[PDB]
Design a binder for this molecule. Structure first.
Ligand SMILES: CC(=O)CC(=O)SCCNC(=O)CCNC(=O)[C@H](O)C(C)(C)COP(=O)(O)OP(=O)(O)OC[C@H]1O[C@@H](n2cnc3c(N)ncnc32)[C@H](O)[C@@H]1OP(=O)(O)O
Ligand SMILES: CC(=O)CC(=O)SCCNC(=O)CCNC(=O)[C@H](O)C(C)(C)COP(=O)(O)OP(=O)(O)OC[C@H]1O[C@@H](n2cnc3c(N)ncnc32)[C@H](O)[C@@H]1OP(=O)(O)O
Lengths: 430, 430
């Protein structure tokens, strides 16, 4: 087994409605300057990743590139992101010399798990001998359509034939449906989900890259007492179980990471104990059946399978973790992710949230920079953002949201669709 | 280096307008039954692949699944094909036991090179120790939109912002644009491309899986002598250089392959010298810049890079090949692929086609079952179909289009976009 190391990476600001970085009718530059395109975000991500990893001027030592992206063919009319990434180093300098020419590249997809699947592909390439240094980048632009057209696009992650009819906001409806069953079993409550949102927004207020950085929300606002916090679904069966503040943001952004094996480190002139490295101890993927849903909506079975495989392969227990990043696409999902990861037992996520165990001051901080709720959710980027967030904490780089006790062990859990794809990784600080 | 073996596979009939298998006004079942959906095609492909590979009843020994698909999100409103593949063994049998539950799965994409990229991802998993048996499947449904809407969807493979404006049929226009430069340099002629189509259709007439199986074309109906073979492009600059018979078909279908390492063969009860096997000696991927095109339209630089890497890794020369499958998305591309692969020198593909060298009776038969022109082109399936076509000839399984001499060595060359992604493999018979 060849060891795999994160050498460095980059996360863009995540932007959309409500960010002062987003150009809309309220913005000074409206009509004069535009928001970044998918191509521009990909170029900023690739370049920033190479720069932060020490590869500027020697990008030719990267052996291959993997791009995670979910819906570029719909939001930007652009597939084939492999060769877009090959062109990203020199984007806008037509005819410049391009050290990535002719290298392997491809795009991987598994809905919001696309970024995590990109890291898996990159790692297989490292362990198979076909690469010693790999670039994995995840990007998404979703702000180019209305929220309602965007909802139909996102519904590509569901069993579209079977489930699109639930609601124009198909995904929010699928999680409202879970939350209804959850509330009926008293597994946890809408108050508890309001506590998740309060935590996410307080964390994002410490994070200048966060979509909702400037938005301050109290527990009371998240719990439905602000009348701007609407129960917005059309489906009358499920609409009482999802507020706006329960939902991840519609964001644009990118995240990238450079991965290396022991031979890659040697080429870069680095030792395996270099203080800039994090080891990926394990990574695992589990996928369930798109066409059939388990009866027990209180459990994310697929996410749990992936987390168990990863922790087992790394030979650690959930109680060994010092930090985690989980797929909080709704407040509802974070709670379930506590239990999928195993930092709470089944029915005890509510204990963790009521006691502050996952806050920055808690014994197991989760989603320290705002998660999908506040940091934002450019779908393809998210799995790589999670990895880089853990890396940033382990390297002391998080500024106002830096954990005081540098974490030795971390985990990520990245989910696609209604718990149909899951990717989980265990990271160990060097 | 772990060796990789093709254990078996399956190709569906490829269907669309002009096939008696396509349900349209001419078909007995018109109005009563519908053409297969993407889900149904994926289920038929996964089940057929398992069946032909000897895995029926033991599908649990498959460690992972990779799906090639380009445009399901547009043509079928469905992404996230990983969990669709997990549900494909038991499709339509709700509640049945599913030995693939929780295995890794993902979708990979690189336009028409998606099927080839799927094979590469599967092979990296086999060589990395995370898998011993893998399933790679490629599927596409494009008959759900008109050929013109479909053209806009296919333009996702181009630099959409830069190139969509050429023509509604963006890809046919990019290849017409090549052909104009090609014709001006006398590199080869429209007569030569007509000879490619005559070959493809005669091959497809021997192949019951072919989209154009029942369509017989004389050379005169390929060479523009028949005015009903229309020059259909809107762009006046390029419209003279492309006839309908020059174009790959808009098809629906699937192809699958089971791949194994030495450990996988052991699990299956097979020896590495078993007569059902074909070794994949090498596979390689090269990707160029989406945003910039080379000046020399007479050369497919990216395709040539991938073929050279694969031949070199296998330690063979082009003159050692007994059979090949190349990416004939237009008659124009087949000609250029002869020279990318190296079975002709630059400017000499025309010699091969004028002398019959790539016919079934020739010294190096290419696209023996009709290629993308007659077999058809469900884009995600194509890379895997190519592999399976070489396999089928090596195993004597091609019936009316079986070669005169069993091939010992074969190659494939699969391309995405306008020579932006290329995947090439070398196969050796056992
Ligand atoms: C599935 C996995 O794998 C895990 C995942 O990743 S799932 C992916 C999760 N992501 C998503 O689904 C995106 C979720 N988030 C969202 O869609 C948005 O954040 C929202 C939650 C939709 C945000 O809303 P917004 O940005 O303010 O946009 P907006 O245009 O106002 O849309 C809200 C809708 O609610 C209603 N609404 C909003 N404000 C309202 C008010 N004050 N009064 C009444 N109704 C209101 C409206 O009907 C509106 O749509 P219409 O104008 O078409 O009616
Ligand atoms: C992107 C990647 O990476 C993938 C690749 O490998 S590259 C992409 C390769 N694939 C393609 O580009 C698809 C190419 N093929 C096609 O679009 C179609 O097969 C084809 C247009 C060549 C033939 O299509 P068809 O469906 O048999 O005929 P039909 O669909 O009835 O009409 C096709 C068009 O031909 C023309 N046509 C047909 N009959 C005609 C007639 N009697 N008179 C004039 N024009 C006629 C029309 O222009 C028609 O389109 P519109 O009606 O929209 O104007």
């Amino acid at each position: 087994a060849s060891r795999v190391f994160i050498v460095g990476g980059h996360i863009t600001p995540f932007v959309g409605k409500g960010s002062p970085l987003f150009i809309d009718k309220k913005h000074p530059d409206f009509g004069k300057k535009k928001n970044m395109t998918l191509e521009e975000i990909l170029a900023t991500t690739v370049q920033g990743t190479m720069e932060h990893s020490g590869l500027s001027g020697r990008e030719g030592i990267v052996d291959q590139v993997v791009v995670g992206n979910f819906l570029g063919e719909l939001f930007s009319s652009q597939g084939h992101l492999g060769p877009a990434a090959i062109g990203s180093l020199t984007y806008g300098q037509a005819g410049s010399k391009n050290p990535l020419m002719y290298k392997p590249a491809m795009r991987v997809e598994g809905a919001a798990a696309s970024g995590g699947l990109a890291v898996i592909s990159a790692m297989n390439a490292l362990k198979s001998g076909s690469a010693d240094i790999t670039l994995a980048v995840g990007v998404e632009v979703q702000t180019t359509a209305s929220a309602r057209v965007g909802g139909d696009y996102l519904a590509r992650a569901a069993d579209y034939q079977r489930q699109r009819q639930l609601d124009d906001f198909t995904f929010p409806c699928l999680f409202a449906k879970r939350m209804k069953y959850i509330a009926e079993h008293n597994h946890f409550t809408m108050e508890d989900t309001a506590r998740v949102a309060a935590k996410a927004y307080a964390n994002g207020n410490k994070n200048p890259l966060a979509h909702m950085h400037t938005r301050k929300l109290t527990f009371e606002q998240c719990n439905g007492e602000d009348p701007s916090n609407v129960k917005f679904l059309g489906n009358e069966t499920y609409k009482e179980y999802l507020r706006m503040t329960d939902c991840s943001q519609v964001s644009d952004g990118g995240a990238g990471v450079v991965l290396a094996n022991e031979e890659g480190l040697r080429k870069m002139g680095l030792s395996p104990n270099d203080s800039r490295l994090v080891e990926i101890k394990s990574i695992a993927c589990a996928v369930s059946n798109l066409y059939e849903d388990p009866d027990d909506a209180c459990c994310m079975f697929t996410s749990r399978q992936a987390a168990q495989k990863a922790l087992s392969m790394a030979n650690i227990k959930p109680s060994d973790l010092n930090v985690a990043e989980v797929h909080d696409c709704f407040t509802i999902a974070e709670m379930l992710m506590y239990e999928a990861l195993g930092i709470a037992e089944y029915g005890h996520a509510k204990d963790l949230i009521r006691n502050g165990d996952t806050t920055l001051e808690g014994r197991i901080p989760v989603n320290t920079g705002g998660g999908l709720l506040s940091f934002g959710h450019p779908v393809g980027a998210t799995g790589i953002k999670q990895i880089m967030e853990v890396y940033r904490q382990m390297k002391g780089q998080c500024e106002a949201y830096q954990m005081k006790k540098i974490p030795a062990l971390g985990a990520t859990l990245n989910m696609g669709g209604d718990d149909k794809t899951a990717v989980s990784a265990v990271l160990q600080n060097i």
